[PDB]
């Protein structure tokens, strides 16, 4: 039951760890949050259990001195807690990015909590800061509980962020949508490729066709419902670039490509 | 599509239909296309009837594909069009082309708005089943009582200066002298006497 990692990030992992930030964010949103710490490389971190899943992987490579070691037989562990104090402890660390390099993180699995120390310097405070839950579940519930099953057959490739007004004009989108309280996708294969949103009411009509098209069968409608905001927050990505493919005309991804750390979000009819 | 327009420079119309927006905002504008260009009618009660006319040279692309007696309406609620309209042409100099479009009969009035890589595109259904056609309270000219042409700043500040006292009733008045000395005013009585 030895879970200890070290968190020091100098130039890529920060804003890695601020999309973690992020994540945590929404899972607090999300009922309930799972982690599967395994190995040191590959440890998944899907949170989600409507009908969503956020199956994205962790490199811990650049991690030092991370291990795994339980008594769940097998090489997969069951670790489930709240992400409540996650967000707490993140934001406390965020803000002392002013000075302050050695002092980092170090979180144990304990029998009962989950301690996380701070060396933070004004003559330097220590803070320690429990994890309240910690609740594990059986094996069993673990390999019955799978994402993934799925194919691809039409993907859309998304341009990455050098274009800001891209991810402003689906910020846009999505305020126009919040103001004016469903999100229908569409897309061709034309060719470069065309995207079409649509939103329809009894008597309101929007359809948006994003101008300048750069990104890389066809006429599939899909109706789903409005929780594509979430995927719309993930996309800014600043690191590297987003992709994402819709098809089947009710099932639509997010994947989010970040040592290659694979961020999709799966969202159902 | 039988009737088409563009445009670039959207201040001018957000202004005109500004001057809509104190009785004209509730629904029930009857847009008309033709050979002359885009006119927009207002008459509520029977009491007043607005006409405000878009030209040719307004529009960049205007087409006019059409093969009838070059008459077509459509009735369609301003205020549908006003809570499109408020969110879009925002900040200034965003160069919002909006593209006008009618398919002649049982089509949406089709409205696309671009600004910076950003498209928009709105269907207006119209309502084209009662409509009486006809109306107009128009008047004859070899008949008019009297003719003023007076400057719009001046007659703006005397409303705006009218407005706030209340003047429920008011009233017109023209008079002309040998001595050049015309007299114009717009009187009225109120609470304030």
């Known amino acids: 039951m030895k879970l200890k990692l070290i968190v020091n990030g100098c130039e890529a992992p920060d804003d890695y760890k601020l999309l973690r930030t992020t994540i945590n964010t929404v899972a607090s949103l999300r009922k309930t949050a799972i982690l599967r710490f395994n190995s040191e490389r590959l440890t998944i971190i899907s949170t989600p259990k409507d009908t969503g899943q956020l199956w994205c992987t962790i490199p811990h490579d650049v991690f030092r001195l991370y291990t795994v070691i339980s008594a769940r037989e097998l090489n997969t562990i069951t670790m489930e807690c709240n992400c409540d104090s996650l967000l707490s402890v993140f934001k406390r660390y965020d803000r002392v990015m002013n000075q302050g390099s050695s002092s980092n993180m170090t979180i144990k699995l304990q029998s009962c909590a989950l301690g996380i120390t701070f060396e933070e310097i004004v003559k330097v405070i220590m803070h320690s800061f429990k994890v309240p839950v910690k609740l594990l579940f059986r094996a069993q519930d673990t390999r019955i509980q799978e994402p993934m099953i799925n194919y691809i057959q039409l993907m859309m490739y998304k341009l990455p962020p050098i274009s800001g007004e891209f991810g402003s004009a689906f910020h846009g989108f999505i305020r126009r949508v919040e103001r004016y309280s469903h999100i229908h996708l569409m897309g061709v294969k034309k060719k470069d490729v065309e995207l ?49 493919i819709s098809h089947d005309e009710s099932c639509v991804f997010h994947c989010s490509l970040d040592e290659r750390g694979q961020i999709i979000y799966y969202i159902a009819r | ?29 009857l847009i008309f296309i033709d ?43 301003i205020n549908h069009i006003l809570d499109s309209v408020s969110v879009m042409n925002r900040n200034s100099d965003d160069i919002v082309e909006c593209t006008l479009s009618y398919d002649g009969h049982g089509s949406p009035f089709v409205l696309i708005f671009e600004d910076s890589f950003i498209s928009e595109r709105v269907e207006y259904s119209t309502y084209l089943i009662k409509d009486f056609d006809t109306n107009g309270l128009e008047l004859d000219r070899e008949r008019i009582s009297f003719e003023a042409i007076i400057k719009g700043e001046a007659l703006h500040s005397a409303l705006k200066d009218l407005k706030e006292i209340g003047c429920k009733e008011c009233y017109v008045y023209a008079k002309t002298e040998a001595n050049d000395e015309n007299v114009f005013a717009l009187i009225s009585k109120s609470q304030l006497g």
Not at chain 2, 38 to 65: A, C, D, G, T, W
Request: charged share 25%; aromatic share 10%.
């Open chain 1, 196 to 244: 079409k949103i649509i939103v329809n009411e009894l008597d309101w009509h929007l359809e948006i066709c994003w101008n300048g098209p750069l990104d890389s069968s066809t006429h599939e409608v899909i109706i789903r419902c409005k929780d594509w905001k979430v995927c719309s927050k993930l996309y800014a990505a600043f690191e590297e670039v987003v992709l994402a």
């Open chain 2, 35 to 77: 050979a002359d260009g885009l006119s927009f009618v207002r008459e509520n009660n029977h009491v007043i009837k607005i006409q405000l006319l878009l030209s040719r040279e307004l529009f960049m692309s205007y087409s006019y594909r059409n093969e009838t007696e070059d008459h077509m309406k459509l009735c369609v609620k």
């Open chain 2, 1 to 29: 599509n039988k009737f088409s327009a563009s445009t670039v420079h959207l201040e001018h119309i957000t202004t005109a239909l500004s001057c809509l927006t104190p009785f004209g905002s509730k629904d029930d504008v």
